[PDB]
């Protein structure tokens, strides 16, 4: 009996907003922002009835590069899309194409960000190459709107970022979930692969008023990693919101968005239970990247810090995954395709897979799983930092700062550098040798660009991003391309 696959992805979602991750490091009611943190009962069910990954990271803490690595089993340079808005190479084979080729009905509902399509001020559905997704009716490339209006039935939709909900407006999280439930009912009696990518926790921290009412008046605490000018000891790749400008209204909005998400994940899980698909359906809860959310005095920033770099990875496969399993092995989005295809018995993406198939970690009987492994992450807009982690030690190399070594056992809040401590010399050496080796193997763009990285603490910063930029002539035809995309390619009539 071929297992079904449902992947639920969020955008800019910090693991600290999930109770499953907060309980792993302490009380579920303690958070960087205190006790009024959002509770995630429905997502936490997947952890309780399955496996939680404590060291899952984005290949790059930016949307397009991470999403690309999740589909391809490849680092962002080999996907064609290391920067946002770049098209993913249409010739590359995705895990969805492998599922399609094994007789699976494939559907994507939500934000793609891999099609390279223009912004038309409204959701751009069916964007770019299918990449193995048969139903892309409710797949749109990019947008931060919170409300949708349905002008024509298929997917002719007007989008709105803010404002009260007008009479025919639907909150996007509910809409996309409602659409996914419909496709799930149609394919419940066949091998099906559904991916719902919800964009809500993302940047425009604007939430539904029925969710905001529950958080706007509550009290929140500024994260203890927040800085003041005289207490700023952060690396320069992270030097912004000082403790004085911590915004509790934006925090309440983010918490309200996460509750809408968890409620809507529950409707998907309630459906599976009612239609008896829980046992033979693999459910994954994940995100493209996380959010600093005022931690380290940063917000919405692609950083090697845990809150931004780390992504939630919770998987429930009742048949082959024991409940309460914790996988501590370090992983990136490059590992998803080989691992998910191995777990489902499906053939691997042919040729180069720069990741590992660790389906054994979930299929074995060990309640706590850890393998000795190092993984590397990359910076998206400017490739200005690189990072390697073994689970406890995190090494950051940059053209904007001298090397930084973090110890999560001794300093979980990543507030101190241990690179120059002679007691950590062997660790630093091992981590630096691996980062350089992985940088060369996975074609780190910084090496091709010749960025001035500092591999020694004696080095000085000499970096102007302008020298590595290629100024570009503006296309005079784009004003007319935008018109034909709106009125001809994606018409509201």
Nearest to a copy of itself of 84, 278 (CB atom):
84
Could you tell me the smallest distance in angstroms from the CB atom of residue 128 to a copy of itself? 6
Question: To the nearest whole angstrom, how small is the minimum distance from the Cβ of residue 350 to Mg ion?
Answer: 30
Distant-in-sequence, close-in-space partners of 222: CB < 8 Å, separation ≥ 6? 33, 243, 246, 294
The listed partner (a copy of itself, Mg ion, none) that binds 216, CB under 5 to 8 Å by sort, is none
Instruction: Indicate which of a copy of itself, Mg ion, none lies near residue 486 (CB less than 5 to 8 Å, by partner kind).
Output: a copy of itself
- Closer CB to Mg ion, residue 163 or residue 381? 381
Look at residue 63 and give the partner it binds from a copy of itself, Mg ion, none, a contact being a CB closer than 5 to 8 Å depending on partner kind.
Mg ion
| Chain residue whose CB lies nearest Mg ion | 63
CB of 399 to a copy of itself, least distance (A): 14
Considering the complex, state which of residue 202 and residue 400 has its C-beta at the smaller distance from Mg ion. Answer: 202
Where along the sequence are the contacts to a copy of itself (CB under 8 A)? 77, 80, 82-87, 90-91, 116, 118, 126, 128-130, 381-382, 443, 445, 448-449, 468-472, 474-475, 477-484, 486-489, 491
| Nearest distance, CB of residue 483 and a copy of itself, angstroms | 5
Residues 6+ apart with CB under 8 A from 401: 235, 236, 237, 385, 454, 461
Q: How far is the CB of 468 from a copy of itself (least distance, A)?
A: 6
Give the one entry of a copy of itself, Mg ion, none that residue 430 binds, where binding means its C-beta sits below a cut-off of 5 to 8 angstroms depending on kind.
none
Nearest CB to a copy of itself, comparing residues 87 and 342: 87
Of 55, 89, 84, 54, nearest to 73 (Cα)?
89
- Partner interacting with residue 464 (select from a copy of itself, Mg ion, none; CB below 5-8 Å by kind): none
CB of residue 461 vs a copy of itself: minimum separation in angstroms? 19
- Which residue number, 408 or 449, has a Cβ lying nearer to a copy of itself? 449
Closest CB to Mg ion among residues 111, 248? 111
Minimal distance in Å, beta carbon 257 to a copy of itself? 26
From the list a copy of itself, Mg ion, none, partner contacted by residue 382 (C-beta under 5 to 8 A by kind): a copy of itself
- Residue 352's binding partner among Mg ion, a copy of itself, none (Cβ under 5 to 8 angstroms by kind) is none
Asked whether the beta carbons of 73 and 67 are under 8 A apart, the reply is: no
- Smallest separation (angstroms) from a copy of itself to the CB of 488: 5
**Among a copy of itself, Mg ion, none, what binds residue 483 when CB lies within 5 to 8 Å by partner kind?**
a copy of itself
Q: Minimum Å distance from CB 79 to a copy of itself? A: 10
Nearer to a copy of itself (CB atom), residue 204 or residue 318: 204
Q: Which does 203 bind (CB under 5 to 8 A by kind): Mg ion, a copy of itself, none?
A: none
Q: For binding to Mg ion (CB under 5 A), which residues are involved?
A: 62-63
């Amino acid at each position: 009996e071929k297992p079904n696959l449902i992947v639920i992805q969020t955008d800019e979602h910090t693991i600290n907003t999930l109770g499953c991750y907060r309980r792993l490091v302490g009380d579920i009611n303690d958070s960087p922002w205190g006790k009024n943190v959002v509770q995630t009962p429905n997502i936490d069910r997947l952890a309780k009835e399955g496996a939680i990954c404590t060291r899952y990271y984005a290949s790059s803490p930016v949307s397009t590069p991470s999403r690309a690595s999740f589909q391809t089993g490849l680092y962002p340079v080999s996907t064609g899309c290391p920067i946002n808005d770049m098209p993913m190479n249409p010739n590359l084979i995705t895990y969805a194409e492998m599922l399609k080729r094994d007789g699976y009905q494939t559907s994507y509902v939500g934000k793609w960000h891999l099609g390279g399509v223009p912004n038309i001020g409204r959701p751009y559905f069916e964007p770019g190459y299918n990449f193995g997704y048969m139903d892309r009716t409710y797949m749109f490339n990019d947008g931060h709107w919170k409300y949708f209006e349905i002008v024509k039935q298929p997917n002719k939709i007007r989008s709105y970022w803010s404002g009260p909900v007008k009479p025919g407006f639907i909150h996007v999280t509910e809409y996309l979930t409602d659409r996914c439930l419909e496709l799930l009912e149609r394919d419940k009696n066949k091998p099906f692969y559904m991916m719902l990518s919800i964009p809500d926790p993302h940047s425009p921290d604007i939430a539904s008023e029925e969710y905001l009412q529950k958080y706007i008046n509550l009290d929140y605490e500024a994260p203890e990693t927040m800085v003041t000018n005289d207490t700023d000891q952060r690396p320069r790749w992270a030097r912004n919101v000082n403790k004085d400008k911590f915004d509790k209204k934006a925090l309440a909005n983010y918490f309200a968005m996460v509750e809408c998400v968890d409620d809507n994940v529950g409707r998907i899980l309630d459906f599976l239970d009612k239609n008896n698909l829980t046992d033979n359906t693999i459910v994954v809860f994940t995100a493209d990247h996380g959010d600093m959310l005022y931690e380290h005095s940063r917000v919405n920033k692609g950083l090697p810090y845990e809150s931004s770099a780390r992504i939630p990875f919770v998987i429930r496969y009742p048949e082959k995954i024991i409940p309460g399993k914790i996988v501590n092995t370090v992983y990136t989005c490059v590992d998803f395709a080989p691992t998910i295809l191995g777990l489902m018995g499906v053939k691997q993406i042919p040729g180069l897979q720069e990741g590992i198939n660790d389906a054994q970690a979930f299929t074995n009987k060990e309640k706590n799983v850890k393998q000795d492994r190092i993984v590397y992450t990359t910076a998206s807009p400017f490739n200005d930092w690189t990072m390697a982690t073994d689970g406890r030690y995190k090494l950051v190399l940059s053209c904007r700062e001298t090397p930084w070594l973090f110890d999560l056992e001794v300093d979980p809040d990543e507030m101190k550098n241990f690179y120059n401590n002679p007691k950590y010399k062997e660790i630093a050496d091992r981590m630096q040798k691996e980062l350089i080796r992985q940088m060369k193997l996975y074609k780190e763009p910084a090496l091709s660009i010749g960025l001035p990285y500092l591999y020694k603490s004696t080095d000085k910063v000499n970096y102007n991003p302008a020298k590595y930029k290629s100024k570009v002539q503006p296309n005079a035809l784009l004003p007319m391309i935008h018109t034909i995309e709106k009125v001809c390619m994606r018409p509201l009539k």
